[PDB]
Coordinates of C-alpha atoms and ligand atoms in Angstrom, one line a residue:
Chain A
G1 CA 74.4 92.8 110.2
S2 CA 78.2 93.6 110.0
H3 CA 80.9 91.3 111.4
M4 CA 84.1 92.8 112.7
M5 CA 87.0 92.1 110.3
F6 CA 90.1 93.2 112.2
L7 CA 91.4 94.2 115.7
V8 CA 93.8 97.0 116.4
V9 CA 95.2 96.6 120.0
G10 CA 96.9 99.4 121.8
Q11 CA 99.3 98.1 124.5
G12 CA 99.3 100.0 127.9
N13 CA 98.3 99.8 131.5
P14 CA 95.0 101.2 133.0
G15 CA 94.6 104.2 135.1
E16 CA 96.0 107.7 135.4
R17 CA 99.1 106.5 137.1
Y18 CA 100.3 105.0 133.8
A19 CA 98.8 107.3 131.2
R20 CA 102.0 109.1 130.4
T21 CA 104.5 106.3 130.7
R22 CA 106.5 104.9 127.8
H23 CA 104.7 101.6 128.1
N24 CA 101.4 103.4 127.2
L25 CA 102.6 104.7 123.8
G26 CA 100.1 102.2 122.2
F27 CA 97.2 103.7 124.1
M28 CA 98.5 107.2 123.2
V29 CA 98.2 106.2 119.5
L30 CA 94.7 104.8 119.8
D31 CA 93.7 108.1 121.6
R32 CA 94.9 110.0 118.5
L33 CA 92.6 108.1 116.1
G34 CA 89.5 110.3 116.6
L35 CA 87.5 107.3 117.9
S36 CA 84.7 106.7 120.5
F37 CA 85.8 104.2 123.0
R38 CA 83.2 102.5 125.2
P39 CA 83.5 99.7 127.8
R40 CA 83.1 96.2 126.5
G41 CA 84.4 93.1 128.3
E42 CA 87.8 93.9 129.8
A43 CA 88.6 96.8 127.5
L44 CA 87.7 100.2 126.1
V45 CA 86.5 99.4 122.4
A46 CA 85.8 101.6 119.5
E47 CA 84.4 100.5 116.1
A48 CA 85.6 102.1 112.9
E49 CA 86.1 101.0 109.2
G50 CA 84.5 97.6 109.9
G51 CA 86.7 96.5 112.7
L52 CA 87.6 97.1 116.4
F53 CA 90.1 99.2 118.2
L54 CA 90.9 98.3 121.7
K55 CA 92.6 99.6 124.8
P56 CA 92.6 96.5 127.2
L57 CA 92.1 97.3 130.9
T58 CA 93.8 94.0 132.0
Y59 CA 97.4 95.5 132.5
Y60 CA 100.0 95.2 129.9
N61 CA 101.0 91.6 130.4
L62 CA 97.5 90.3 130.5
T63 CA 96.1 91.8 127.3
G64 CA 95.9 88.4 125.6
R65 CA 92.8 87.8 127.8
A66 CA 91.0 90.7 126.1
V67 CA 92.2 90.0 122.5
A68 CA 91.8 86.3 122.1
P69 CA 88.0 86.1 122.9
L70 CA 87.3 88.8 120.4
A71 CA 89.4 87.1 117.7
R72 CA 87.7 83.8 118.3
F73 CA 84.2 85.3 118.3
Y74 CA 84.7 87.2 115.1
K75 CA 87.0 84.5 113.4
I76 CA 89.6 87.2 112.8
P77 CA 92.9 85.7 111.6
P78 CA 96.3 86.8 113.0
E79 CA 97.1 88.8 110.0
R80 CA 94.0 91.0 110.7
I81 CA 95.3 91.7 114.4
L82 CA 97.6 94.6 114.7
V83 CA 99.3 95.2 118.2
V84 CA 100.6 98.7 118.6
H85 CA 103.3 98.8 121.3
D86 CA 106.4 100.4 122.5
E87 CA 109.6 98.8 121.6
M88 CA 112.9 99.1 123.4
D89 CA 114.8 97.5 120.5
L90 CA 114.3 100.6 118.4
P91 CA 115.3 104.1 119.1
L92 CA 112.7 106.8 119.7
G93 CA 111.9 108.2 116.3
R94 CA 111.8 104.8 114.6
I95 CA 108.7 102.8 113.8
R96 CA 108.6 99.4 112.3
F97 CA 105.9 97.0 111.2
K98 CA 106.6 93.3 111.8
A99 CA 104.5 90.3 111.0
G100 CA 105.1 87.9 113.8
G101 CA 108.5 86.6 114.9
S102 CA 110.2 87.4 118.3
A103 CA 108.7 89.4 121.1
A104 CA 112.1 90.7 122.0
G105 CA 111.1 90.3 125.7
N106 CA 108.0 92.4 125.4
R107 CA 105.6 90.7 127.7
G108 CA 102.5 92.2 126.2
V109 CA 103.4 90.7 122.8
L110 CA 104.0 87.4 124.7
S111 CA 100.6 87.7 126.4
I112 CA 98.9 87.9 123.1
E113 CA 101.0 85.1 121.6
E114 CA 100.0 82.8 124.5
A115 CA 96.3 83.7 124.3
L116 CA 96.0 83.4 120.5
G117 CA 98.2 80.3 120.3
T118 CA 100.3 81.9 117.6
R119 CA 103.0 84.5 117.4
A120 CA 102.0 85.4 113.8
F121 CA 99.8 88.4 114.5
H122 CA 101.0 91.7 113.2
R123 CA 102.7 94.4 115.2
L124 CA 103.4 98.2 114.9
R125 CA 106.6 98.6 116.9
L126 CA 107.1 102.2 118.2
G127 CA 110.7 102.7 119.3
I128 CA 111.4 104.1 122.7
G129 CA 115.1 103.4 123.0
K130 CA 116.6 101.3 125.8
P131 CA 118.3 102.0 129.1
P132 CA 122.0 101.6 129.5
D133 CA 121.5 98.1 130.8
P134 CA 118.6 95.6 130.1
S135 CA 118.2 94.9 133.9
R136 CA 116.6 98.4 134.1
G137 CA 113.8 97.7 131.5
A138 CA 110.8 97.7 133.9
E139 CA 111.9 101.0 135.4
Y140 CA 112.5 102.5 131.9
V141 CA 109.1 101.5 130.4
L142 CA 107.1 102.6 133.5
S143 CA 108.8 106.1 133.4
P144 CA 107.5 109.0 131.5
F145 CA 109.3 110.3 128.5
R146 CA 112.0 113.0 129.3
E147 CA 110.9 116.5 128.5
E148 CA 113.4 116.7 125.7
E149 CA 111.9 113.6 124.1
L150 CA 108.4 115.0 123.9
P151 CA 108.7 116.7 120.5
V152 CA 109.9 113.4 118.9
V153 CA 107.0 111.5 120.7
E154 CA 104.6 113.9 119.0
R155 CA 106.0 113.2 115.5
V156 CA 105.9 109.5 116.2
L157 CA 102.3 109.6 117.4
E158 CA 101.3 111.3 114.2
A159 CA 103.2 108.9 112.0
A160 CA 101.7 106.0 113.9
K161 CA 98.2 107.1 113.4
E162 CA 98.9 107.2 109.7
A163 CA 100.5 103.8 109.9
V164 CA 97.5 102.2 111.7
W165 CA 95.1 103.4 108.9
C166 CA 97.6 102.2 106.3
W167 CA 97.5 98.8 107.7
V168 CA 93.8 98.6 108.1
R169 CA 93.4 99.5 104.4
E170 CA 96.5 97.8 102.8
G171 CA 97.9 95.2 105.2
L172 CA 101.4 94.9 106.3
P173 CA 103.9 94.7 103.4
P174 CA 102.9 98.0 101.6
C175 CA 102.8 99.9 104.9
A176 CA 106.2 98.5 106.0
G177 CA 107.7 99.6 102.7
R178 CA 106.8 103.3 103.4
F179 CA 106.9 103.6 107.2
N180 CA 109.9 101.3 108.3
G181 CA 112.5 103.6 107.1
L182 CA 111.2 106.9 108.6
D183 CA 113.5 108.6 111.1
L184 CA 111.2 110.9 113.1
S185 CA 114.1 112.1 115.3
Chain B
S2 CA 85.7 109.8 98.3
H3 CA 88.3 112.5 99.2
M4 CA 91.8 112.4 97.7
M5 CA 94.3 114.8 99.0
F6 CA 97.2 114.6 96.5
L7 CA 98.3 113.2 93.1
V8 CA 101.7 111.8 92.4
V9 CA 102.3 111.4 88.6
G10 CA 105.0 109.4 87.1
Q11 CA 106.2 110.4 83.6
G12 CA 106.6 107.7 81.1
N13 CA 105.3 105.9 78.0
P14 CA 103.1 102.8 78.2
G15 CA 104.0 99.4 77.0
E16 CA 106.8 96.9 77.5
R17 CA 108.8 98.5 74.7
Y18 CA 109.4 101.6 76.7
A19 CA 109.6 100.2 80.3
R20 CA 113.4 100.3 80.5
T21 CA 113.9 103.6 78.8
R22 CA 115.3 106.7 80.3
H23 CA 112.0 108.6 79.7
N24 CA 110.3 106.0 81.9
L25 CA 112.4 106.9 85.1
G26 CA 109.2 108.4 86.6
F27 CA 107.3 105.1 86.0
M28 CA 110.3 103.2 87.5
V29 CA 110.1 105.3 90.7
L30 CA 106.4 104.7 91.1
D31 CA 107.1 101.0 90.6
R32 CA 109.4 101.0 93.6
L33 CA 106.9 102.5 96.0
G34 CA 105.3 99.1 96.9
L35 CA 101.8 100.0 95.6
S36 CA 99.1 98.1 93.8
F37 CA 98.3 99.7 90.4
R38 CA 95.5 98.8 88.1
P39 CA 93.7 100.5 85.2
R40 CA 91.6 103.5 86.0
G41 CA 90.7 105.8 83.1
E42 CA 93.8 106.7 80.8
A43 CA 96.1 105.6 83.6
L44 CA 97.3 102.8 85.8
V45 CA 96.4 104.1 89.3
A46 CA 97.2 103.2 92.9
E47 CA 95.7 104.5 96.0
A48 CA 97.8 105.1 99.2
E49 CA 97.9 107.5 102.1
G50 CA 94.8 109.3 101.0
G51 CA 95.9 110.2 97.5
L52 CA 96.5 108.7 94.1
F53 CA 99.5 107.6 92.1
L54 CA 99.4 107.7 88.3
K55 CA 101.3 106.0 85.5
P56 CA 99.4 107.4 82.5
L57 CA 98.5 105.5 79.5
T58 CA 98.3 108.6 77.4
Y59 CA 102.0 108.6 76.3
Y60 CA 104.5 111.0 77.8
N61 CA 103.6 114.0 76.0
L62 CA 99.8 113.9 76.8
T63 CA 99.9 113.1 80.5
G64 CA 98.0 116.2 81.4
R65 CA 94.9 114.7 79.9
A66 CA 95.0 112.0 82.7
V67 CA 95.9 114.3 85.5
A68 CA 93.4 117.1 85.1
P69 CA 90.1 115.2 85.5
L70 CA 91.2 113.8 88.8
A71 CA 92.6 117.1 90.1
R72 CA 89.4 118.8 89.1
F73 CA 87.1 116.2 90.6
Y74 CA 88.8 116.0 93.9
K75 CA 89.7 119.8 94.1
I76 CA 93.4 119.0 94.5
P77 CA 95.4 122.2 94.5
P78 CA 98.5 122.3 92.3
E79 CA 100.8 122.3 95.3
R80 CA 99.5 118.8 96.1
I81 CA 100.4 117.4 92.7
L82 CA 103.9 116.0 92.3
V83 CA 105.3 115.2 88.8
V84 CA 108.1 112.7 88.9
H85 CA 110.2 112.9 85.7
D86 CA 113.6 112.4 83.9
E87 CA 115.5 115.7 83.5
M88 CA 118.3 115.9 80.9
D89 CA 119.5 119.2 82.5
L90 CA 120.7 117.3 85.6
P91 CA 123.3 114.6 85.6
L92 CA 122.5 111.1 86.5
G93 CA 122.8 110.9 90.3
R94 CA 121.1 114.2 91.0
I95 CA 117.5 114.7 92.2
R96 CA 115.8 118.0 92.8
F97 CA 112.4 119.1 94.1
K98 CA 111.0 122.2 92.4
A99 CA 107.9 124.1 93.1
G100 CA 106.5 125.7 90.0
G101 CA 108.5 127.3 87.2
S102 CA 109.1 126.7 83.5
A103 CA 108.7 123.3 81.8
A104 CA 112.2 123.7 80.4
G105 CA 111.1 122.0 77.1
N106 CA 109.8 118.8 78.9
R107 CA 106.6 118.1 76.8
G108 CA 105.1 116.0 79.6
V109 CA 105.5 118.8 82.2
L110 CA 104.1 121.2 79.5
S111 CA 101.1 118.9 79.0
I112 CA 100.3 119.0 82.7
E113 CA 100.7 122.8 82.9
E114 CA 98.4 123.2 79.9
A115 CA 95.8 120.8 81.4
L116 CA 95.9 122.3 84.9
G117 CA 96.1 125.9 83.7
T118 CA 98.9 126.6 86.1
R119 CA 102.7 125.9 86.6
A120 CA 102.3 125.9 90.3
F121 CA 102.5 122.1 90.7
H122 CA 105.5 120.4 92.2
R123 CA 108.2 118.3 90.4
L124 CA 110.7 115.7 91.4
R125 CA 113.3 116.1 88.8
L126 CA 115.5 113.0 88.2
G127 CA 118.7 113.7 86.4
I128 CA 119.5 111.6 83.4
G129 CA 122.3 113.6 81.7
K130 CA 122.6 115.1 78.2
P131 CA 123.2 113.2 75.1
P132 CA 126.6 113.9 73.3
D133 CA 124.8 115.2 70.1
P134 CA 122.0 117.6 71.3
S135 CA 120.0 116.7 68.2
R136 CA 119.8 113.1 69.4
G137 CA 117.7 114.1 72.6
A138 CA 114.6 112.2 71.5
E139 CA 116.6 109.1 70.8
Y140 CA 118.6 109.4 74.1
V141 CA 115.4 109.4 76.2
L142 CA 114.0 106.5 74.2
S143 CA 117.0 104.3 74.9
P144 CA 117.9 102.2 77.9
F145 CA 120.5 103.3 80.4
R146 CA 123.9 102.0 79.7
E147 CA 125.2 99.0 81.7
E148 CA 127.6 101.2 83.6
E149 CA 124.8 103.7 84.6
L150 CA 122.6 100.9 86.1
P151 CA 124.2 101.1 89.6
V152 CA 123.6 104.8 89.8
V153 CA 120.0 104.3 88.5
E154 CA 119.5 101.9 91.4
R155 CA 120.6 104.4 93.9
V156 CA 118.5 107.2 92.4
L157 CA 115.4 104.9 92.4
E158 CA 115.8 104.1 96.1
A159 CA 116.4 107.7 96.9
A160 CA 113.5 108.9 94.8
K161 CA 111.2 106.3 96.5
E162 CA 112.1 107.9 99.8
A163 CA 111.7 111.4 98.4
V164 CA 108.2 110.7 97.1
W165 CA 107.0 109.5 100.5
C166 CA 108.7 112.5 102.2
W167 CA 106.8 114.8 100.0
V168 CA 103.5 113.1 100.6
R169 CA 104.0 113.4 104.4
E170 CA 105.9 116.7 104.7
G171 CA 105.5 118.8 101.6
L172 CA 108.2 120.2 99.5
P173 CA 110.5 122.4 101.6
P174 CA 111.6 119.8 104.1
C175 CA 112.1 117.3 101.4
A176 CA 114.1 119.7 99.1
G177 CA 116.3 120.2 102.2
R178 CA 117.0 116.5 102.5
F179 CA 117.3 115.5 98.9
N180 CA 118.4 118.3 96.6
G181 CA 122.0 118.2 97.8
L182 CA 122.4 114.5 97.3
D183 CA 124.8 113.1 94.7
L184 CA 124.4 109.5 94.1
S185 CA 126.9 109.2 91.2
Chain C
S2 CA 108.6 87.1 82.4
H3 CA 105.1 86.8 83.6
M4 CA 105.1 84.0 86.2
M5 CA 101.9 82.2 87.0
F6 CA 102.9 80.5 90.3
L7 CA 105.7 79.7 92.8
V8 CA 106.4 76.2 94.1
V9 CA 108.8 76.3 97.1
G10 CA 110.6 73.4 98.6
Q11 CA 111.6 73.7 102.2
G12 CA 115.1 72.6 103.1
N13 CA 118.6 73.6 104.1
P14 CA 121.5 73.9 101.6
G15 CA 124.5 71.7 101.9
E16 CA 125.5 68.0 101.9
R17 CA 125.0 67.5 105.5
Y18 CA 121.3 68.4 105.2
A19 CA 120.5 66.7 102.0
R20 CA 119.2 63.5 103.5
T21 CA 117.6 65.0 106.6
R22 CA 113.9 65.0 107.3
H23 CA 113.7 68.7 107.0
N24 CA 114.9 68.4 103.4
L25 CA 111.8 66.5 102.1
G26 CA 110.7 69.6 100.2
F27 CA 114.1 69.8 98.4
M28 CA 113.8 66.1 97.7
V29 CA 110.4 66.6 96.0
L30 CA 111.7 69.6 94.0
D31 CA 114.7 67.4 92.8
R32 CA 112.2 64.7 91.8
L33 CA 110.6 67.1 89.3
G34 CA 113.4 66.6 86.8
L35 CA 114.0 70.3 86.3
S36 CA 117.2 72.3 85.7
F37 CA 117.8 74.6 88.7
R38 CA 120.3 77.5 88.6
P39 CA 121.2 80.2 91.0
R40 CA 119.2 83.2 91.2
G41 CA 119.2 85.5 94.2
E42 CA 119.2 83.6 97.4
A43 CA 117.7 80.5 95.7
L44 CA 118.1 77.7 93.1
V45 CA 115.4 78.4 90.6
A46 CA 113.8 76.4 87.7
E47 CA 111.1 77.4 85.2
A48 CA 108.4 75.2 83.9
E49 CA 104.7 75.5 83.0
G50 CA 104.8 79.3 83.2
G51 CA 105.9 79.5 86.8
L52 CA 108.9 79.2 89.1
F53 CA 110.2 76.4 91.3
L54 CA 112.5 77.3 94.1
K55 CA 114.9 75.6 96.5
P56 CA 115.9 78.6 98.7
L57 CA 119.5 78.9 99.8
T58 CA 118.5 80.9 102.8
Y59 CA 118.3 78.1 105.3
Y60 CA 115.0 76.6 106.4
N61 CA 113.8 79.3 108.8
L62 CA 114.6 82.2 106.4
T63 CA 112.9 81.0 103.2
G64 CA 110.4 83.9 103.3
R65 CA 113.1 86.3 102.4
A66 CA 113.5 84.5 99.1
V67 CA 109.8 83.8 98.5
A68 CA 108.2 87.1 99.3
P69 CA 110.1 89.4 97.0
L70 CA 109.7 87.1 94.2
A71 CA 105.9 86.8 94.7
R72 CA 105.6 90.6 94.9
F73 CA 107.8 91.2 91.8
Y74 CA 105.6 88.9 89.7
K75 CA 102.3 89.9 91.4
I76 CA 101.6 86.3 92.3
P77 CA 98.6 85.9 94.7
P78 CA 99.3 83.7 97.7
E79 CA 97.0 80.9 96.6
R80 CA 99.4 80.4 93.7
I81 CA 102.3 79.8 96.1
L82 CA 102.7 76.2 97.1
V83 CA 105.1 75.4 99.9
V84 CA 106.2 71.7 100.0
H85 CA 107.5 70.8 103.5
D86 CA 107.9 68.2 106.1
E87 CA 105.2 68.2 108.8
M88 CA 105.8 66.8 112.3
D89 CA 102.0 67.0 113.0
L90 CA 101.3 64.2 110.5
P91 CA 102.7 60.7 110.6
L92 CA 105.1 59.5 107.9
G93 CA 103.0 58.2 105.0
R94 CA 100.5 61.1 105.1
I95 CA 100.5 63.7 102.3
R96 CA 98.0 66.5 102.8
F97 CA 97.3 69.7 100.8
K98 CA 96.3 72.6 103.1
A99 CA 95.1 76.1 102.4
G100 CA 96.2 78.5 105.0
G101 CA 96.1 77.8 108.7
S102 CA 98.7 77.8 111.4
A103 CA 102.3 76.8 110.8
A104 CA 102.0 74.2 113.6
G105 CA 105.4 75.4 114.9
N106 CA 107.2 74.9 111.6
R107 CA 109.6 77.8 111.6
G108 CA 110.0 77.7 107.8
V109 CA 106.3 77.9 107.1
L110 CA 106.3 80.7 109.7
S111 CA 109.1 82.5 107.8
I112 CA 106.9 82.5 104.7
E113 CA 103.7 83.6 106.5
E114 CA 105.6 86.4 108.2
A115 CA 107.4 87.6 105.0
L116 CA 104.2 87.4 102.9
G117 CA 102.1 89.0 105.6
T118 CA 99.4 86.3 105.1
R119 CA 98.6 82.7 105.8
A120 CA 96.7 82.4 102.5
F121 CA 99.4 80.4 100.7
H122 CA 99.1 76.7 99.9
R123 CA 101.0 73.9 101.5
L124 CA 101.8 70.3 100.6
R125 CA 102.4 68.8 104.0
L126 CA 104.5 65.6 104.0
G127 CA 104.2 63.9 107.3
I128 CA 107.3 62.9 109.3
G129 CA 106.0 62.1 112.7
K130 CA 107.4 63.7 115.9
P131 CA 109.8 62.6 118.6
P132 CA 108.4 61.4 121.8
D133 CA 109.7 64.4 123.6
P134 CA 109.2 67.7 122.0
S135 CA 112.4 69.0 123.4
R136 CA 114.4 67.1 120.8
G137 CA 112.5 68.3 117.8
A138 CA 115.4 70.2 116.3
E139 CA 117.6 67.0 116.4
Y140 CA 114.7 65.0 115.0
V141 CA 114.2 67.2 111.9
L142 CA 117.9 67.5 111.3
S143 CA 118.4 63.7 111.4
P144 CA 118.1 61.3 108.4
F145 CA 115.2 59.0 108.3
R146 CA 115.5 55.5 110.0
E147 CA 116.2 52.5 107.9
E148 CA 112.7 51.2 107.9
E149 CA 111.3 54.6 107.0
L150 CA 113.1 54.9 103.7
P151 CA 110.8 52.7 101.6
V152 CA 107.9 54.8 102.9
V153 CA 109.8 58.0 102.1
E154 CA 110.2 56.8 98.5
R155 CA 106.4 56.3 98.1
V156 CA 105.8 59.7 99.6
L157 CA 108.3 61.5 97.3
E158 CA 106.7 59.8 94.2
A159 CA 103.2 60.8 95.3
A160 CA 104.4 64.3 96.2
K161 CA 105.9 64.8 92.7
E162 CA 102.6 63.8 91.3
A163 CA 100.8 66.2 93.6
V164 CA 103.0 69.1 92.7
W165 CA 102.2 68.6 89.0
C166 CA 98.5 68.3 89.9
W167 CA 98.5 71.6 91.8
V168 CA 100.4 73.5 89.1
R169 CA 97.5 72.6 86.7
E170 CA 94.5 72.4 88.9
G171 CA 95.4 74.0 92.3
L172 CA 94.5 72.8 95.6
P173 CA 90.9 71.4 95.9
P174 CA 91.0 69.1 92.9
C175 CA 94.3 67.7 94.0
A176 CA 93.4 67.4 97.7
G177 CA 90.6 65.1 96.3
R178 CA 93.3 62.8 94.8
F179 CA 96.0 62.8 97.5
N180 CA 94.7 63.7 101.0
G181 CA 93.3 60.3 101.8
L182 CA 96.5 58.4 101.0
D183 CA 98.5 56.6 103.7
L184 CA 101.7 55.5 102.1
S185 CA 102.8 53.7 105.2
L186 CA 100.2 50.9 104.4
Ligands
AMP201 N1 111.5 94.8 123.6 C1 110.8 95.3 124.6 N2 109.9 96.4 124.4 C2 109.2 96.9 125.4 N3 109.1 96.4 126.7 C3 110.0 95.4 126.9 C4 110.8 94.8 125.9 N4 111.6 93.8 126.5 C5 111.3 93.8 127.8 N5 110.2 94.7 128.0 C6 109.6 94.9 129.4 O1 110.7 95.2 130.2 C7 110.5 94.6 131.5 C8 111.8 93.9 131.9 O2 111.7 92.7 131.2 P1 113.0 91.7 131.4 O3 114.0 92.2 130.5 O4 112.5 90.4 131.1 O5 113.6 91.9 132.8 C9 109.2 93.8 131.4 O6 108.1 94.6 131.9 C10 109.0 93.7 129.9 O7 107.7 93.4 129.4
AMP202 N1 105.0 71.1 112.7 C1 106.3 71.1 112.4 N2 106.8 70.5 111.3 C2 108.2 70.5 111.0 N3 109.1 71.1 111.7 C3 108.6 71.6 112.9 C4 107.3 71.6 113.3 N4 107.2 72.2 114.5 C5 108.4 72.5 114.8 N5 109.4 72.2 113.8 C6 110.8 72.4 113.9 O1 111.2 71.7 115.0 C7 112.2 72.3 115.7 C8 111.8 72.3 117.2 O2 110.8 73.4 117.2 P1 110.4 73.9 118.6 O3 110.2 72.6 119.4 O4 109.3 74.9 118.4 O5 111.3 75.1 118.5 C9 112.5 73.6 115.0 O6 113.6 73.5 114.1 C10 111.2 73.8 114.4 O7 111.2 74.6 113.2

């Protein structure tokens, strides 16, 4: 039988309340992949291309609970885990791959770091911009996008879908080389 | 099993030619971050659902490496981009062109002959004109001068971006963004 | 230049770091007897068809020197050896390791992140750890204690031998000759 070779994890929160918030951009990418998600453990899980795509149902800062058991079961190394998430440290229109390093305060990234015991999983950072002050971060990410931002969101979603498949096929450095410098604004 | 596009770099194979002007197209493909290996009469890399070619045919016979793949995969000419040195543009200029004449470029002519159409796209990378117009073959088979190397570096970084632009967005948006640049 | 391998010594540049525990990798590279010169953000030497590097990046940034070089020369990660001090082994231990976690070593993390893989080789030179982990930065940026220095000499000699071994035979054969040593005995 086959054995799953990679995890692609979309960050978000469960339920209709949160489906259109900036903090669900990772779920919005996973829903653009043409996949068949089904319930498994504490997530919605799709298989494609010999690995797993998941939208955890844990809430955003508890996704590590859903990712780490799957990684351990399948012996999937951090470089074959890609966490797709919104990023306040980049403007909307910018996308960046990153292997490891800081979480920049993103508590979903931190959840997965604690659960795995390593920071060195891969990330696809989807810029959403930042409020005028950092003390407004929770409110900013749990808001929807402004209507005027929607056309850019659509371009980013499309780019991100391409990026995900790039990474699955090629790993991080090649994909970073062609996607990091895009300005979708 | 389905390939959506071909990007073809012009050049001659071998270390002897790797730094020559007529290898500008190879040099751009070598900046894209891909993994090339031998495949037919070419070094080929796969990325983004298409193929990138550095032919092994020599410059003037590149069509022979392009056409089997275009035929097999049913790639229309508008999804083939030929990246090549252009003596009719100065060093520092880059221009997208859809279709049209080969303008004496024997590699471009080889591709037109092999595909049976001019409709394919080109990324023309200016290299300037030799002083003596009878020394054009020798000019393209020489290295860039020391003092041109900084401009070459800018044009390679730009052309790298331009190729990816074309892959994602097609030619009009990218001609919009690049054709006006002057990196000299 | 076709380059068959990269051997990287972890350290920081400058006199004030030269004798610190975190400079064991530089100390091994200086034991090789080679002629290093500046090249990019590194001191570089050539021998046996490959490259030997003391990056000038600082310890936690060495991936920025290593990864572009490896990509330029198409060097697979298993032909990259990183020589470094290791708090998770006692002084006197010398262990080759393929892949695995960085164990918190921020220089090994730099390389893993920049390469986008764990798959490079390491020559782990034990230095022990402080009794409280909250003074780890001071511990690594300290010289060895007086009584430690004779041990360090045995470890540097063995590590020079081990680098030459690995250049020729790579990791398993050389692990078979070095990994059971305890030079504190
Ligand atoms: N770089 C970031 N990208 C996305 N979400 C973030 C980032 N930094 C902070 N957050 C979220 O913003 C909220 C405010 O976090 P804090 O800044 O620690 O007050 C929390 O829900 C974080 O998970
Ligand atoms: N296993 C290790 N070997 C060597 N240096 C380490 C190791 N773990 C942590 N360090 C360094 O120790 C310092 C303290 O690390 P930490 O306690 O994580 O931030 C930093 O400079 C780390 O890079």
